[PDB]
């Protein structure tokens, strides 16, 4: 396996990204540190995570250290729903970067496609819990996005979230400037994609697999709910392997041509989760391990289930 994959803006990915979704204030400083030390090249981030500068106080000492260059980082951001605004779309960024103590990000997605009223609240909410739209095209959001590479803020533009008309209608606009380079998806053996990420690779489009454990630390998590770490046949593969069922969810996606971003914050796991480059599941194994979806999706936000643009009424 190469560590990278090559995107259709002519730079090259790491297929192993650090997660930081959830990820403490008062953590993801010594995780992201921790992180570097031990291997990993790419950090995936967002404003509304809220840890942004934390992140990037760990980012600005491993370069001031020079125990990586910036040119071997691969740092991805997100812009939220409330600034898909042409007027805001830039200033989100320059704040993500003066957070990120960086002046450029390798790869800025849109979060989702669903726009909301900008203001401070990140889900701006009707009376009754819906949330509160914007008109903004996303057509348009796309050209400020195309924008922020022409400025030099961001080397690589891309989407997340987008569903496959959603994806085709970036690649259908009129006058489209730049291709998206990425598609984040959530993905995982209970949530497979085989439908969305075969669109997206045919078209040159990199999937990174967010959520790849089953995102076990997700608020609205329940006892009774599926367990990706805790399945017996997934645990077997594992140890046929002599790895950990993290280690074979990470590696699956790997194998499928994707990147893939779980998160951790505790330092023996982030350590854990980058050894996965030294086996390979068989075929077989990976078929077995697509055998086990089922449309399991936990990020699903029902606030936005009425949104012009939500993605996941479509099928893929
Ligand atoms: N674009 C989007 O809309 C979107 C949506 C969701 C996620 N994401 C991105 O994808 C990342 C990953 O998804 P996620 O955070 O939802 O969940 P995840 O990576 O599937 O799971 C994270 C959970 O797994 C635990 N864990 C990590 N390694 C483990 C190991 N070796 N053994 C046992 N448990 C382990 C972590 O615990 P500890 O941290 O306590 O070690 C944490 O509770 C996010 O952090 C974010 O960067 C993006
Ligand atoms: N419910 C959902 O699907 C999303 C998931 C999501 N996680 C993530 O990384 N991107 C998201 O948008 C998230 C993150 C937040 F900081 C706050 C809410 C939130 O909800
Ligand atoms: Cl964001």
């Known amino acids: 396996m190469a560590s990278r994959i090559l995107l259709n803006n002519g730079a090259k990915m790491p297929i192993l990204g650090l997660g930081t979704w959830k990820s403490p204030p008062g953590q993801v400083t010594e995780a992201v540190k921790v992180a570097i030390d031990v291997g990993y ?13 934390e992140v990037g106080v760990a980012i600005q000492e491993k370069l ?3 125990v990586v260059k910036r040119e071997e980082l691969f740092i991805v951001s997100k812009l939220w729903c409330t600034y898909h605004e042409k007027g805001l779309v830039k200033g989100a960024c320059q704040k993500t970067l003066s957070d990120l103590k960086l002046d450029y990000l390798d790869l800025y ?3 989702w496609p669903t ?5 401070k609240e990140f889900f701006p909410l009707d009376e009754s819990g819906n949330v509160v739209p914007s008109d903004t095209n996303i057509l348009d959001t796309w050209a400020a996005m195309e924008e922020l590479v022409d400025e030099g803020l961001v080397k690589a533009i891309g989407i997340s979230n987008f569903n496959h008309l959603q994806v085709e209608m970036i690649l259908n606009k009129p006058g489209l400037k730049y291709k998206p380079a990425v598609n984040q998806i959530e993905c995982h053996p209970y949530l497979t994609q085989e439908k969305l990420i075969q669109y997206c690779q045919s078209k040159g489009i990199v999937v990174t697999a967010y959520s790849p454990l089953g995102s076990p630390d997700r608020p609205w998590a329940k006892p009774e709910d ?6 017996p046949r ?12 993290a280690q074979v969810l990470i590696r699956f996606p790997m194998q499928r041509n994707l990147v893939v971003i779980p998160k951790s914050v505790t330092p023996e796991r982030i350590a854990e989760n980058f050894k996965v480059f030294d086996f390979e599941l068989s075929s077989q194994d990976m078929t077995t391990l697509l055998s086990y979806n089922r449309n399991w999706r936990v ?14 009424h479509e099928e893929f």
């Open 226 to 231: 599926p367990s990706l770490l805790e399945d």
């Open 109 to 111: 997605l849109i979060h």
């Open 115 to 119: 726009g909301f009223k900008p203001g």
């Open 41 to 53: 090249r790419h950090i995936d981030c967002a404003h509304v995570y809220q840890n942004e500068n």
């Open 234 to 245: 997934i645990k077997a593969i594992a140890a046929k392997h002599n790895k950990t069922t």
């Open 64 to 66: 001031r250290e020079q």
């Open 299 to 312: 990020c699903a936000p029902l606030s936005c289930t009425s949104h012009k643009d939500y993605p996941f």
